[PDB]
């Protein structure tokens, strides 16, 4: 659903995020042009399951940075609630300190744009989107609520897209087929 279409500009958003330094900032996806973006949703802050998946993406943020890529998480919870969760010990089911921004989507409009809203619950599914350095959507991943995403799979995808992107830096050949270029016997 939504307006997220492969090969098209990823839907832009402007939203209040909790930055890795713990400050609030109003950010837009378009701020990250020039870099690949891994943009992922999760349903809710402060549930009874540990945010293992989020901690894994933040823990391995260096592997994304090595690929010139920015990871950004989002949920429908307020940015105040994101910061509370950051400031909650992991042994109390908290996130702990984050190496990635966490976007707040309290109007559900970003989730709807990305077609990942679970309407009967008012929360996002586990959607993950790979957006290239030109802002173009390259990959859609959406899981039902019980099953997490893999950092290894995500890094595989980012590197494969970038490999092919980089091989598009080409110049005209300066070789022309003709009667002269037929292979000798």
């Amino acid at each position: 659903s939504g307006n997220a279409k492969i090969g098209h500009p990823a839907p832009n958003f402007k939203a209040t995020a909790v930055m890795p330094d713990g400050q609030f900032k109003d950010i837009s996806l378009s701020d990250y042009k020039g870099k690949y973006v891994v943009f992922f949703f999760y349903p809710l802050d402060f549930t009874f399951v540990d945010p293992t998946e989020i901690i894994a993406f933040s823990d391995r943020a260096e592997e994304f940075k090595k690929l010139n890529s920015q990871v950004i998480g989002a949920s429908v919870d307020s940015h105040f609630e994101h910061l509370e969760w950051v400031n909650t010990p992991k042994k109390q089911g908290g996130l702990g300190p984050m190496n990635i921004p966490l976007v707040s989507d309290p109007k559900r409009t970003i989730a709807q744009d990305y077609g990942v809203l679970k309407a009967d619950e008012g929360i996002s599914f586990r959607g993950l989107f790979i957006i290239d350095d030109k802002g173009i959507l390259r990959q859609i991943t959406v899981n039902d609520l019980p099953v997490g995403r893999s950092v290894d799979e995500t890094l595989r995808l980012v590197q494969a897209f970038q490999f092919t992107d980089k091989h598009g830096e080409v110049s005209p050949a300066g070789w022309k087929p003709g009667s002269d270029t037929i292979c000798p016997d």
Partner: protein, 101 residues
């Protein structure tokens, strides 16, 4: 598809998708190319025209054959040229397709 077999310089071929090479398969092709080159068929090369008539040559198959010619330090590789459009290219490359001039 263009009729004869053309000897395409290795250096002009654009190979934008990753391939996994088997070194023993590369080496087996190296030896065959030396002994009986006629038994190693041409690779298929897509010849695309850029917006301003630039020439581009894409190789999507024949990874082992290409590596074997490289290994052999050959200038060119036998190939069938297939005249193709930017639309054809976009099938392979999606939003990685360059604005070819």
């Amino acid at each position: 598809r263009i009729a004869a077999v053309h000897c395409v310089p290795l250096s002009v071929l654009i190979r934008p998708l990753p391939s996994v090479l088997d070194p023993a398969k590369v080496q087996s092709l190296v030896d065959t190319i030396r002994e009986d080159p006629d038994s190693v068929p041409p690779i298929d090369v897509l010849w695309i025209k850029g917006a301003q008539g630039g020439d581009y040559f894409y190789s999507f198959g024949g990874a082992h054959r290409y590596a074997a010619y490289q290994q052999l330090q050959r200038e060119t590789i036998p190939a069938k040229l297939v005249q193709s459009t930017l639309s054809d290219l976009r099938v392979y490359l999606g939003a990685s397709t360059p604005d070819l001039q």
